[PDB]
Design a protein around this ligand. Sequence first.
Ligand code: NAG
Ligand code: ADE
Length: 246
Amino acid sequence: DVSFRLSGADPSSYGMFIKDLRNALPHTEKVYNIPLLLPSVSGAGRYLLMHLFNYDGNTITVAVDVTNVYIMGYLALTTSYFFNEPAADLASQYVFRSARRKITLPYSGNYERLQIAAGKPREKIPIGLPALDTAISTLLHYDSTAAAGALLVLIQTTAEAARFKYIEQQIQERAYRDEVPSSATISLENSWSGLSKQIQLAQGNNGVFRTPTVLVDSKGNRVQITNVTSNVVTSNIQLLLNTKNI
Ligand SMILES: *[C@@H]1O[C@H](CO)[C@@H](O)[C@H](O)[C@H]1NC(C)=O
Ligand SMILES: Nc1ncnc2[nH]cnc12
């Protein structure tokens, strides 16, 4: 299990949490010095439990698929909550079994369905440590519309930060003040699968991408990533989605 506490939290303590989250994900192989997530894990071992504590010390436990860093659901007191999708239903067979009741959320866990349910694109949803504190508090008591926004915050401040050093840094900048994600942040989130595939395909292609990945940079300009010498590969991305899952 990994844990993060919002009470007394700073850029340093959050950085330690994101480090712990990454290190909790199993790998047997590194591709270009980047941990390669496993094709599959059988049983309960597929799911990492994140214990998150809001400022007041109230807590939720989030279940994360260790093969793709995908949030399946969470436990709030005696109620478990799971996304409306097969992978999350599978997860419910293994995690939070001691919960008195299980609620299936009226949406799947992908960005498209969450944004529809929240009524806004995540381009308009402020993120950061304060937002995460709100998110935890919101998930403590069931409210499906409010939960959609909270989960968008949660996904970006945990899973996406684990996947990209840039996003981790973005949240660290937002330690005491929330701000909507940069277009670069949105770009990276949308491109994790694409980048993971092309980095793996570069192995056997002299570090060259079979298909160039189009991103948006810090300034807001559109750029092409064509090989492993790019900063996105050498510095940014921290975990690779296995091609078997793409
Ligand atoms: C690799 O990408 C860089 C940009 O990061 C570019 O300058 C260089 O020409 C590329 N090399 C090859 C062999 O494609
Ligand atoms: N549920 C989820 N967990 C992690 N990353 C995601 N990206 C989109 N949906 C996600």
